[PDB]
């Protein structure tokens, strides 16, 4: 055990850094916070329908293997995180 929980793989690390995350190991809480921040400041969510994230053409969409996803049905987000966070 240690204080940090996960090490993101490179494309996810880039996303987290783009949102203002510092360093390269994190708690899962930090990963979720900065991923949300990224989506917020890249404005990938639909202004009208804000559960919908349009990530096609973004590195996040590359990672998800998807043009969009819903935060109300976040299972592909968790799929991606399971694949792109390496446990410490």
């Amino acid at each position: 055990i240690q204080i940090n929980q996960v090490r993101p793989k490179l494309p996810l690390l880039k996303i987290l850094h783009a949102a203002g995350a510092q360093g390269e190991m994190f708690t899962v809480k930090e990963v979720m916070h900065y991923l949300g921040q990224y989506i917020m400041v890249k404005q990938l969510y639909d202004q009208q329908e804000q559960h919908m994230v349009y990530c096609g053409g973004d590195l996040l969409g590359e990672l998800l293997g998807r043009q969009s996803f819903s935060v109300k049905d976040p299972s592909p987000l968790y799929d991606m995180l399971r694949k792109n966070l390496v446990t410490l």
Binding site: M32, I39, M40, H51
Partner: peptide
Amino acid sequence: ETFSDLWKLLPE
């Protein structure tokens, strides 16, 4: 709803 409000509801 608000993106940040929905996002905050997500579990670990």
